[PDB]
């Protein structure tokens, strides 16, 4: 009667925050790109044709983009993908031979400071006897002299081993949906204004996240999801000048990057089996890679960010933009991949401004490096094989990674500079609206129900 | 008022609804609980824990006086120390998420009074009652 009795319910909407092993999903057309397994999609699960989003009415859940484990899982996934993708590839161990290089064939000036070097060296053929006098063409960032001609060496021969990327695979970022196993679920924040931390008013659940392309880049966030209405400013600690400031754009910034060098692929044979893809002579003029950003689009984008920065640093304050402080080449430049090559662009023409409380294109100098050691990894050095023909790419600038100086003088003006380094921040710009929860369908509740006595 | 019948909210649909209203959606969260070289082994270990989590709940659901899923009753008096709330104050004024946050402290205690005091003493009573 009035004295209650417990009753077991199975299938109750009860979840608690937890961490699990997420699997992948990447459409069915992404598997049709073939080309001997591009990137990752080999045994990845085809995406559900009609994904479902159940809008959880009256539900308010707290998210935390800076302590979200989906990021820490994705970062370790792409890294293992990189090592697994270089395991059956050609290893360039006998390429650390002495290189007798000279300037590339051009006509002065003395300010061209070479950059491109025409290197000649010995090489092992298929047989283990007679040698091989072959030549290649390396970038200045890939070689380093050592003390008759001027003598160089590969910049990684004194750091770690080196492996050549197979020409069969491609570095094209393809959409990857992250899904949760049975009994688990992924919550999605649907508010138009959300800084990644705190309770979310309009929460919906999904089984698989939207298509997130693993674009590895620094300083400039490329091809990401645009924010809603006004641009968003997200940071783990605004008061701390040591924590990075992730910015998300509303309107995409058209960026145009080219490689004005018709390269030729020389396929020298270091047999038996293995084959190295050298750089032959260049067809045409010796020009350097560059990226263009329309001054009109960039002026409006920067003015929309500084107006949002004043909501945190005082209404009437002066915000000045300056380029990077220094360090590695991957931190001071806009590192990205386009057509297989690895560009490194000078962003000193983008962060040169000073905004108070109230028709052409911007060309940026881009250098190219072939031998890389991404993700702060030592031991595994990758030689990006040369790409034939002029490479052209058009991307969307959808966000920034800024750092603030400590020089203060705090209540007056504030200076912001481009940062990066940790690529884990790059995943946080897309996983800010997702989190993993555990379903506990077992919930007990009292009611005026008693069982039998097998009467 | 006029009505055109029942509607559907989906998986975890009635998460923000009252416990009494969310008790109608039990057969929805029960449906999607099982759902039918490396990187391919990552999903295998996930699909193994999914069924371990299912049989874990099914074993608990079996050793209690239920086995038959969805809903089931028990002969255990609700101790007043476990947040003394009313019948009309729980099913018509509380969500399952808000409720599990309060009873989380006594969930493990209640589980013990269900497996031991009941089907071990109830079924043994049936062995004495079924022989005559």
């Amino acid at each position, epitope marked *: 009667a009035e004295n209650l009795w417990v009753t077991v319910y199975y299938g109750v909407p009860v979840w608690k925050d937890a961490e699990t092993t997420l699997f992948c999903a990447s459409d069915a057309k992404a598997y049709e790109t073939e080309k001997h397994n591009v990137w990752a999609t080999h045994a990845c699960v085809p995406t559900d044709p009609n994904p479902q989003e159940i809008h959880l009415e009256n539900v308010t859940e707290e998210f935390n983009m800076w302590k979200n484990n989906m990021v820490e899982q994705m970062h370790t996934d792409i890294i293992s993908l990189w090592d697994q993708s270089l395991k059956p590839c050609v290893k360039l161990t006998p390429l650390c031979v002495t290189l007798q290089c000279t300037n590339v064939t051009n006509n002065i000036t003395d300010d061209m400071r070479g950059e491109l070097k025409n290197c000649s060296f010995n090489m092992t053929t298929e047989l283990r006897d007679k040698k091989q006098k072959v030549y290649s063409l390396f970038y200045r960032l890939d070689v380093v002299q050592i003390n008759s001609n001027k003598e160089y060496r590969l910049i990684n021969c004194n750091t770690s081993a080196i492996t050549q990327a197979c020409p069969k695979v491609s570095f094209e970022p393809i959409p990857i949906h992250y899904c949760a196993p049975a009994g688990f679920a992924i919550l999605k924040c649907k508010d138009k204004k959300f800084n990644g931390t705190g309770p979310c008013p309009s929460v919906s659940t999904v089984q698989c996240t939207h298509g997130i392309k693993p674009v590895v880049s620094t300083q400039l966030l490329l091809n990401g999801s645009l924010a809603e209405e006004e641009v968003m400013i997200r940071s783990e600690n605004i008061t701390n000048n040591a924590k990075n400031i992730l910015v998300q754009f509303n309107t995409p910034v058209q960026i145009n990057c080219t490689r004005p060098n018709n390269n030729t692929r020389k396929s020298i044979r270091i047999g038996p089996g293995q084959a190295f893809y050298a750089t032959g002579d260049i067809i045409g003029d010796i020009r350097q890679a560059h990226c263009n950003v329309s001054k009109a689009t960039w002026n409006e984008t920067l003015g929309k960010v500084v107006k949002q920065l004043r909501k945190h640093f005082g209404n009437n304050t002066i915000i000045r933009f300056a380029n990077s402080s220094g360090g590695d080449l991957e931190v001071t430049t806009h590192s990205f991949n386009c057509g297989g090559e690895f560009f490194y662009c000078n962003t000193s023409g983008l962060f040169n401004s000073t905004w108070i409380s109230n028709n052409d294109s911007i060309t940026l100098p881009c250098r190219i490096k072939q031998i890389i050691n991404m993700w702060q990894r030592i031991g595994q050095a990758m030689y990006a094989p040369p790409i034939q023909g002029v490479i052209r790419c058009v991307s969307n600038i959808t966000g920034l990674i800024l750092t603030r100086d400590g020089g203060s003088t705090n209540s007056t003006t504030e200076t912001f500079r481009p940062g990066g380094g940790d690529m884990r921040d790059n995943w946080r710009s897309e996983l800010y609206k997702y989190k993993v929860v555990k379903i506990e369908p077992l919930g007990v509740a009292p009611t005026r129900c008693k069982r039998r006595v097998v009467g | 008022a006029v*009505g055109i019948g029942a509607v559907f909210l989906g998986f975890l649909g009635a998460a923000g609804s009252t416990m009494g209203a969310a008790s109608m959606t039990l057969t929805v969260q029960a449906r999607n609980l099982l759902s039918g070289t490396v990187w391919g082994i990552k999903q295998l270990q996930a699909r193994v824990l999914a069924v371990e989590r299912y049989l874990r709940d099914q074993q608990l659901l079996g050793i209690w006086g239920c086995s038959g899923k969805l809903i089931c009753c028990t002969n255990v008096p609700w101790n007043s120390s476990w947040s003394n709330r009313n019948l009309s104050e729980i099913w018509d004024n509380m969500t399952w998420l808000q409720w599990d946050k309060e009873i989380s402290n006594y969930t493990q205690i209640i589980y013990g009074l269900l497996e031991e005091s009941q089907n071990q003493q109830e079924k043994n009573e049936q062995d004495l009652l079924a022989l005559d």
Partner: antibody
Amino acid sequence: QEVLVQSGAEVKKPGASVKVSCRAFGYTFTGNALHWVRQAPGQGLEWLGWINPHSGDTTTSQKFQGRVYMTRDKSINTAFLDVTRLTSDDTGIYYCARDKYYGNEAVGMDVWGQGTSVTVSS
Amino acid sequence: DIQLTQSPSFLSASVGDKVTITCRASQGVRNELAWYQQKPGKAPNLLIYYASTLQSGVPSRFSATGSGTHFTLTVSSLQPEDFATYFCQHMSSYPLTFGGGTKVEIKR
């Protein structure tokens, strides 16, 4: 986030039929009954009927019974209104509107589509 | 059908006035009655349901009363965005019907 998006304006001749669509975003399409309401230019609001998107069951205002037809496609979160045997009296703006549907009954229309203009003329 | 009659059809008021508009039903509809706001060129917005309950996000200056055949909607102090047409609607039986509308205009 919770919005209804309707198809664009349409013109039809008398006697023909028009099919207008309404797609639900930001909520579970099958969780709320859906009304269709029209407004002749300069006039008030007239209820045509409503549909349960879960079951597909419909009830039509008897003035329009056998002339106006309500259907749904759950996969695309979209409801359809077929208005047949048109005359000039059917000219106006057509709205879809979600009902709060508390207690599985009509309570109030809390989210409206932007409306679809339909003109019937020769 | 049930007829809902709103009065007045056209109400003139100044910014700051307290005003009350009336909706009468030809038969008893209990509390099963909603109020809407409509502006030229826009879809209606829900203000009131269950005859007296404020819809989420509607400003507190809106209130409503009544049961049976007599209903009112009151604005405690009119603001410029409140001058618009207002409709009442019953859901007590088929077919659903709307009132003829009350247009609130600014005095000058």
